[PDB]
Write an enzyme that holds these catalytic residues in place. Sequence first.
Site, PDB file in Angstrom:
ATOM      1  N   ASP A 215      88.930  59.545 -97.675  1.00  0.00           N
ATOM      2  CA  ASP A 215      88.432  60.537 -97.577  1.00  0.00           C
ATOM      3  C   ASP A 215      86.976  60.383 -97.044  1.00  0.00           C
ATOM      4  O   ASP A 215      85.745  60.280 -97.863  1.00  0.00           O
ATOM      5  CB  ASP A 215      87.963  61.449 -98.798  1.00  0.00           C
ATOM      6  CG  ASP A 215      87.393  62.868 -98.614  1.00  0.00           C
ATOM      7  OD1 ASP A 215      86.813  63.203 -97.786  1.00  0.00           O
ATOM      8  OD2 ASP A 215      87.845  64.046 -99.535  1.00  0.00           O
ATOM      9  N   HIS A 216      86.589  60.576 -95.657  1.00  0.00           N
ATOM     10  CA  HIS A 216      85.468  60.192 -94.996  1.00  0.00           C
ATOM     11  C   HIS A 216      84.113  61.060 -95.385  1.00  0.00           C
ATOM     12  O   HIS A 216      83.008  60.790 -95.333  1.00  0.00           O
ATOM     13  CB  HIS A 216      85.627  60.082 -93.668  1.00  0.00           C
ATOM     14  CG  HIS A 216      84.571  59.184 -92.903  1.00  0.00           C
ATOM     15  ND1 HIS A 216      83.845  58.508 -93.305  1.00  0.00           N
ATOM     16  CD2 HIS A 216      84.753  59.038 -91.456  1.00  0.00           C
ATOM     17  CE1 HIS A 216      82.865  58.092 -92.303  1.00  0.00           C
ATOM     18  NE2 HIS A 216      83.442  58.467 -91.138  1.00  0.00           N
ATOM     19  N   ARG A 217      84.437  62.399 -95.983  1.00  0.00           N
ATOM     20  CA  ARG A 217      83.290  63.096 -96.389  1.00  0.00           C
ATOM     21  C   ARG A 217      82.645  62.311 -97.695  1.00  0.00           C
ATOM     22  O   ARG A 217      81.610  62.583 -97.695  1.00  0.00           O
ATOM     23  CB  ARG A 217      83.604  64.596 -97.102  1.00  0.00           C
ATOM     24  CG  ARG A 217      84.605  65.277 -95.992  1.00  0.00           C
ATOM     25  CD  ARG A 217      85.133  66.693 -96.624  1.00  0.00           C
ATOM     26  NE  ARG A 217      86.029  66.241 -97.536  1.00  0.00           N
ATOM     27  CZ  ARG A 217      86.839  67.246 -98.289  1.00  0.00           C
ATOM     28  NH1 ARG A 217      86.589  68.264 -98.260  1.00  0.00           N
ATOM     29  NH2 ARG A 217      87.684  66.659 -99.296  1.00  0.00           N
TER      30      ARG A 217
END
Lengths: 243, 243
Positions: A215-217
Site C-alpha cells: 500500500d503505497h500510502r
Amino acid sequence: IPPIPPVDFAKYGEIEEVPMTRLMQIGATNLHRSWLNVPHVTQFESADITELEAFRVAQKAVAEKAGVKLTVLPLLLKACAYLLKELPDFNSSLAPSGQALIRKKYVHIGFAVDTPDGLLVPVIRNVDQKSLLQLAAEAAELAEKARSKKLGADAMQGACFTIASLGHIGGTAFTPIVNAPEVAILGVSKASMQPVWDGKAFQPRLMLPLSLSYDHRVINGAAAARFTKRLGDLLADIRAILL
Amino acid sequence: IPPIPPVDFAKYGEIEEVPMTRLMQIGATNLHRSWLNVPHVTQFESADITELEAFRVAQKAVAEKAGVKLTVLPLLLKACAYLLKELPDFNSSLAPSGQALIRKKYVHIGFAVDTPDGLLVPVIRNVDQKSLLQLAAEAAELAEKARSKKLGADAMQGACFTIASLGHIGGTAFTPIVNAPEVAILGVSKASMQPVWDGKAFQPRLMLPLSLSYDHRVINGAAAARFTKRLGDLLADIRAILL
C-alpha cells in the site's frame, strides 16, 4: 464508477451460465474494495535459497519423525515474522481517520489456500513465537480444515500480513493484491537454477522469486525495496534470525 | 581422609611463602567438596565448527554495529540451552535425600572467568530466551564486572550448568570438575584444522574439542555420549535450533 456495458454473449455462439459460490462472491467484493482503496506497487526481488533448500531436505528425517512436512512455507513465515518486527510499518494499518497508522505489536500471518469453493486465508497467530516444526504442523492443519470447509471464521481473522505461494504450480512472478486493511502481501513463485555472478564466473544458485505488493500510502518505494532486500538476505542465511 | 604429611621444604633450598586470596581459598574448598562428592567421568567429543566459524566472522559487521563482540561463547550458550531442554536430566540436581532429582524448568548457565584473584563463574539467566547478540553483550559485561571485582554475589547464583572455555589459550582437551550441585560442566579447548574423511578423501574441517564432565550418579555413559553427540550435531548446523 462507470459500469461495464452488458453484451449479449449468445449472439456469438453457445453460452452456458454457471453460478458463483457465496465464497467467490465474497472474495470478489473484497478484492474490488482493496483494488479501489489501495494504490498498489509491486516490488520484485530474488532470494538465493540454495542453502535453505539443502537444510529443508536434510531435516526430512526430523520432520517425518514429528509427522509434519517441512516445506518452504514455515521458513518463509519465520523470516517474515522476524522482519515484521524489524520494520514495523509493514506490521501496521491505516487508521480510519486517514491520519494515523495503527502499529500492531503482535505478528499473526495469513497464507492463501486455494480451495474449490474459493480462496481462504487462514491465520497463524504469533508466528514470531513458534518454531519451524510448530508452524509446519499448524500450517498443514489449517490448510486441511480450509479444504474440508471446517475452518471456523475465527481462524480467518486479525492477520497482519499475507503470504501467497504459487511456487508449487509455476510462474516467474506475479503482482498480488493487498488484503486491506493489511498493508502488504508477499507473493512467492517457482524456484529455478539461475547463473549468478560470483565476481569471476557464473555459479548455479537456486533462486526464489518474491513479489511484494504494498500500500503505497503507507509504504514508500525505499522501504519496500529494503524489506525484500532484508528478506532475500535472511533466506540466503536463515541463521541471521538467531542473533 | 588421611592428610598429606608436612615436608620441611627449606631443607632442599630457598623457599618463599605467598598467601592465598580469600577467593582462592573459597575456590579450593568448593573444588575439594565436589571432588569427594561427585564420581566424575569425562566424555570427549569434537564438533565440526567450519560453518559456524564462517557465520561468526561474516556477522562481524552486525556485531560491531551492535557494540558486542561475537565469539564462540554465545553460540555455545545458545546450543547448550536448547539441549538442556531436550535432555532434562542434565538440567537437574540430586535432591539432598539422595533419592530424587530436582529437575529445573529454567535454564541459567554459568561460564568460567579466570581473574587475578581467582575463578569467578557469573551466571546468565534464561539463556534459552536470549539472542546471540543479547548473550554476547551480557557475557562481555559480566566478565568485565568479574575482573573488576564489581560482580555482585547475586549474579553468581542458581546456575544449572557451567561452560569452561580455554580455547583462547590452548590445549586439546581437559577433564573439568563438576560444580556441585550442578550435574555437568562443558570444557571447550582450541579449534584446529583436522582431516576428516568424506567417504572418499580427507577434507580439512575446523574441529572444536569438547570435554563434558558429569556426575555419574545422575548421568550414565550413554546419556552423556548422546549429549556431546547432539551438541556436536547442533554446532555443525546451528539452524537445527530453529526447528
